[PDB]
A paper describes a structure:
Omega transaminases (ω-TAs) can mediate the chiral amination of several unnatural substrates without the requirement of an α-COOH group and are highly relevant in the production of several pharmaceutical intermediates of commercial interest. In this work, we successfully overexpressed and characterized the two recombinant transaminases TA_2799 and TA_5182 from P. putida KT2440 and solved their crystal structures. The overall structural fold of the TA_5182 and TA_2799 enzymes is similar to that observed for other class III fold type I TAs with two α/β domains. There are two highly flexible loops present in the structures of TA_2799 and TA_5182 that mediate the entry and exit of the cofactor and the substrate/byproduct into the active site of the enzyme, leading to significant conformational changes in the enzyme structure.
The crystal structure of L322F mutant of TA_2799 was solved at a resolution of 2.5 Å. The TA_2799_L322F mutant was crystallized in its apo form, with a sulfate ion bound in the phosphate-binding pocket of the enzyme. We expected PLP electron density in the crystal structure of the TA_2799_L322F mutant; however, only sulfate ion density could be seen. PLP may have been present at the active site, but not covalently bound as an internal aldimine, and thus, the sulfate ions from the crystallization mother liquor could compete and displace the PLP molecule out of the active site pocket. In the crystal structure of the TA_2799_L322F mutant enzyme, the ND1 of the N121 residue maintains hydrogen bonds with both OE1 and OE2 of E123, which provides further stability to the anion-pi stacking interaction between E123 and F322 in the same monomer. Apart from that, the OE1 of E123 forms a hydrogen bond with OG of S120, forming an extensive intersubunit network that stabilizes the dimer. The effect of the L322F mutation is observed in the thermal stability assay, as the mutant enzyme has an increased ∼6 °C melting temperature (Tmapp) over the wild-type TA_2799. The mutant enzyme’s affinity towards the cofactor PLP is clearly enhanced as observed by the yellow coloration of the enzyme solution post-purification and the characteristic peak for PLP at 420 nm seen in the absorbance spectra of the purified enzyme, similar to the report of Kwon et al.. The mutant enzyme efficiently converts (R)-PAC to (1R, 2S)-NE even without external cofactor addition to the reaction mixture. The TA_2799_L322F mutant showed the best increase in stability; it retained ∼70% of its activity even after 96h of storage.
Numbering used by the authors:
A (entry chain A): 4 to 459
B (entry chain B): 6 to 458
The structure:
Amino acid sequence: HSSTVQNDLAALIHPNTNLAQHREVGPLVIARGDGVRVFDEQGNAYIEAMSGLWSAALGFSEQRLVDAAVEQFKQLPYYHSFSHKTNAPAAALAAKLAALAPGDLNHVFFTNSGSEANDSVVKMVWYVNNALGRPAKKKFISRQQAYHGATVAAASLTGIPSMHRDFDLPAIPVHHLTCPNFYRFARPGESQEAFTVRLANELERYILAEGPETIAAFIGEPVIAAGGVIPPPTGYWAAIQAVCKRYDILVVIDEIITGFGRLGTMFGSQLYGIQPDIMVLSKQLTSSYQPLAAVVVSDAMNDVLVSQSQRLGAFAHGFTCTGHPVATAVALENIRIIEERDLVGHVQHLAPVFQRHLRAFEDHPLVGNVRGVGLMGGIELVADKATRQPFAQPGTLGGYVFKQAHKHGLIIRAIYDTIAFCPPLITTQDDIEAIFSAFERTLADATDWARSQHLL
Amino acid sequence: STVQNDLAALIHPNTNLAQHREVGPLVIARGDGVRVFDEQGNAYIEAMSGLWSAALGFSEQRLVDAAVEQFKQLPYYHSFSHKTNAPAAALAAKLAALAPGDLNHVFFTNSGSEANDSVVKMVWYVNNALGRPAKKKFISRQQAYHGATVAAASLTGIPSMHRDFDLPAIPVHHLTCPNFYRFARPGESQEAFTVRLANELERYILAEGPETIAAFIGEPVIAAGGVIPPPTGYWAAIQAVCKRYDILVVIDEIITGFGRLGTMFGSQLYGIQPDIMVLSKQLTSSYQPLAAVVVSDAMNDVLVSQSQRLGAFAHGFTCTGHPVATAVALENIRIIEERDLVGHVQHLAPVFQRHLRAFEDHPLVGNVRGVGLMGGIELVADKATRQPFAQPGTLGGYVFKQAHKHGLIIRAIYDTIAFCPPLITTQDDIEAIFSAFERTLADATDWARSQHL
């Protein structure tokens, strides 16, 4: 027990942690960062194959981000954006994001987190529809296994059952479509194109049952990340958009994870041909070196927001650190770096090698499914490959892989019994070989451990 | 280029977005102690510390140094799945020690809004765990401010924050605003007002059913709703009622925290023992986005017992416990303690309050109120009848704009002028503030005649 461990154990409530287990096993203290690696307090190295929380695009020791922070700290360490006040980095970053975003996504509202951002979206949509004299048009459509944040509103949009348990969620009008997961929900011999068609029919039937005039918006990640790295089936996004367009339902695309090159395009929306009305960004926006998120909205949306100020006085919504000069300065440098080094290009060239390494595990006895796009992938472990069936208590094996991978210098994320990989954009071919080498040893240990636990 | 960029692409918080297209932004470029400078080089005394937040002013190098030091070690890591970092852990322990009572467990967020949102979820979670599914309603107050997320803004009780947002969206009741000047009956004492306010709460609980009411939330002093200190005895009475019906007491110190009222926490000044305390703003002087929820041992025990059967506390933000933001909070608090800035406020408060009170007999001023280094000057149309103006906020709106021409940034809360200067404010700064305000108020007296009110 070091000073940090004693302090942690006394006083710190951990997010997304088994708080009871935590009292027994205690924390793992991370002390230092170096490229795609982080080091614990004892000096052990770990390849961070998840970029932290899908977030650390430029790795854990990019000096240029520190420099951008330092530069801005010396000018103006803090000011707000209320009552017409602004600062240069926020304004520049707004314009940058307006330019990068497809279509007429040209207006930016800043928050600290993805959660706050999605919460802001819910409020904006309600506000807009009230302004347009459509009081009934307020319901959001999401999907099972979606993740959209942790505030009451955002977590309501979230569709992972464990994130709702005992939190009285959803607490706002939300309907969750089935998870677009071909491996799990496709019928025998059904094509992806046919699955897409059923998924789109599911959406349309729901709209018609509820009444289109009651449905304001659809929200979705291009690829479902925290829900188990589930890429969409072929044609999914074109079908979903066509239905939304037919019934005047806003399309809200959550690129909190997919944004800034993760899928081999700057935004996942480009890869899947999505034209959002609203796009939400965070994480790789700053490599999480600073808390920042952005809501980008259409000119149409913005026009309604503005027309509301005409009759209501002010847009009565904001956070203290909305537009923080340091956080936005860091985002600007982060984006400069991604463009200048063509890291989107790098991902396109690295993706096939990353995916090939993933696919290598298809024929493993424990592996039921492998899936991935760009530089994000998942390996789902199952009890029986024939019946694609999960384990007695899902997450037992994944939980073990998560712990055991540490002993081989690897940090991954277990989503129940799916192992997730989302390495930094600066990952090299050599880093990939190191990751999967370490994972192969972990999976060997797991194969042993699973037999002695009589799980298979 | 900043203005063109702003006008093209930036949706401003808490701004008239239509007016913004016409007048455009004011670009703030540089900071120096209690001053900020625009792009054109004009100086302004920031008598609001930004948003009640910049405790150590706008150019404290030690905070930058703490940030830089931490950036070079570990610029980012998360606190999920048992992971931790040294600053987060140290800050948790520090806050656990500073907080009164058995407030010993800390959960970190980026904002006050997220923090209060977390509180709502924690309370619901705990009551579900303890087999009380109906016990979920929050009690707040008119003019309260608790944040801008759907849930937090629902707790907020400023009507303009709800307009056209379909809020509240969760079970909440708003008590009358504890504002003696405004809502006392003729010749009523503060002690009597408090008694009615406490009775109001109790009778509401009994009418709704105590088994449906989970928690009370309140700022010790209502800040954003118009710098409204509680009436005498208020907090003792409110606590007694809450205790009687097993209603959690949640104290929002997002603004009052870290010396603002002349004690480290406002809870100490007013003898409040919270079950839950919420902190932000002055926690980092807003140099980094950070907030903290501090909870009792009892609360925490239930959170822990839930992990035993659910497998996880299924709540978190990416930047929960951010090593840089927490590092900065630690240094910020170290600085407040080392310089005894709580002590500084105690010695400066009487001078600050005296300067405020000087305006009591001004023709435009109906009421002056304040505690510690927070104050408000409420402008009215008639001092006799304590009556507001035709459209509230017209005069205050003018004072806000006009003060800029005299190098002063304040905040207009409708027609109440708010003052919340940095903890590092000096006696000289105070004289400069009120000097500039006196000129502003003179301009306002002229402007009010020509507008016929």
